Amino acid sequence: QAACPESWIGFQRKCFYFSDDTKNWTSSQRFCDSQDADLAQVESFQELNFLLRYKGPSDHWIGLSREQGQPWKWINGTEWTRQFPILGAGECAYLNDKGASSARCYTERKWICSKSDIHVG
Amino acid sequence: TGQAACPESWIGFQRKCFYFSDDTKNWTSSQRFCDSQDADLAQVESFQELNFLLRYKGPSDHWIGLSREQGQPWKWINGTEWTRQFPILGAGECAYLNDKGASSARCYTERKWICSKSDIHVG
Ligand SMILES: *[C@@H]1O[C@H](CO)[C@@H](O)[C@H](O)[C@H]1NC(C)=O
Ligand SMILES: *[C@@H]1O[C@H](CO)[C@@H](O)[C@H](O)[C@H]1NC(C)=O
Ligand SMILES: *[C@@H]1O[C@H](CO)[C@@H](O)[C@H](O)[C@H]1NC(C)=O
Ligand SMILES: *[C@@H]1O[C@H](CO)[C@@H](O)[C@H](O)[C@H]1NC(C)=O
């Protein structure tokens, strides 16, 4: 039994999907959720550097959002742990070529989903 | 619970694990390195695998695990003929991936390399 779904990319105990199309942040989340996954929950610098190597030049949504004055939260609503900086004053995070940035959630970008591999309890 | 499908520093794709080198070696020394890790120079088995390697590898040329006798069909490391899933340019004896596709050169040239092997959940 494969650790990751067909055409997804395996790194450590996680599985990643890089989109071909563009969507706004919420619709990308809906796509990831339909496949038992979330917008990429990036948990370490190593993970970030893996994603940046693969992603290519397009901006890619990840699974961090905030209310404008509040801290960044993971998809589950837990406050995120600041493993890398995020540029800007936007409500929705994405990966550009230098790291993490932010934008209005209604903009259309490619996206990354992540999920644990199936052999995780 | 369980264990990672691939070793640390290897990337998973379609039931295999891939290692992208940071150093350079000739084709035979690159293969010796892969062998030490129970792996082979990448046995590229699809157009989708080709695209995956081109996308992850970066700007450097990387050796892969196809070779041929000068004038004959490309062979995998196990000696059996390759199925021709894409073009391989050039008149060289040993295959590699450049910035755009698959090409070929003299086996003594020093380049980055890619190893592949099956993930642990195979069998
Ligand atoms: C919420 O999600 C993040 C990233 O997936 C994880 O690190 C964190 O522990 C989670 N907290 C929960 C489920 O309480
Ligand atoms: C987000 O995308 C969906 C799907 O295309 C669309 O229905 C919706 O209007 C979008 N939201 C905004 C604010 O444009
Ligand atoms: C030779 O290698 C190719 C590519 O990995 C594969 O199709 C075939 O199974 C191999 N032959 C063996 C293991 O006998
Ligand atoms: C490849 O390079 C190594 C240096 O590590 C050298 O020892 C070896 O003989 C070379 N062999 C071939 C076949 O090119």
Author numbering:
A (entry chain B): 72 to 192
B (entry chain A): 70 to 192
Extract from the study:
Human LLT1 is a C-type lectin-like ligand of NKR-P1 (CD161, gene KLRB1), a C-type lectin-like receptor of natural killer cells. Similarly to mouse Clr-g, human LLT1 is a type II transmembrane glycoprotein which consists of an N-terminal cytoplasmic chain, transmembrane and stalk regions and a C-terminal CTL domain with two predicted N-linked glycosylation sites. In this study, we present several structures of LLT1 under various conditions: monomeric (LLT1_mono), dimeric deglycosylated after the first N-acetyl­glucosamine unit (LLT1_D1 and LLT1_D2) and dimeric (packed into hexamers) with homogeneous GlcNAc2Man5 glycosylation (LLT1_glyco).
The dimeric form follows the classical dimerization mode of human CD69. In contrast, it is 173.7° for LLT1_D1 and 177.7° for LLT1_D2, both of which crystallized in space group P212121 with one dimer in the asymmetric unit. The dimeric interface in all three LLT1 dimers is based on a hydrophobic core formed by phenyl rings, analogous to that observed in similar CTL dimers: Phe121, Tyr125, Phe89, Phe87 and Phe82. Additionally, there is an interaction formed by π-stacking of arginine residue Arg124 of both chains, and a pair of His190 residues forms a partial stacking interaction in the termini region (the part of the CTL domain oriented towards the cell membrane). There are six common hydrogen bonds that connect the monomers in all three dimers: AGly81 N–BGly81 O, AArg124 N∊–BTyr125 O, AArg124 Nη1–BLys126 O and the three analogous hydrogen bonds with exchanged chains. Additionally, there are some hydrogen bonds specific to individual cases: one additional hydrogen bond in the dimeric interface of LLT1_glyco, two hydrogen bonds in LLT1_D2 and six in LLT1_D1. As an example, residue His190, localized near the C-terminus in the dimerization interface, is charged at low pH and destabilizes this part of the interface. It is apparent from the structures that His190 is neutral in LLT1_D1 and LLT1_D2 (pH 7.0) and is close to His190 (3.1 and 3.3 Å) from the opposite chain, participating in a partial stacking inter­action.
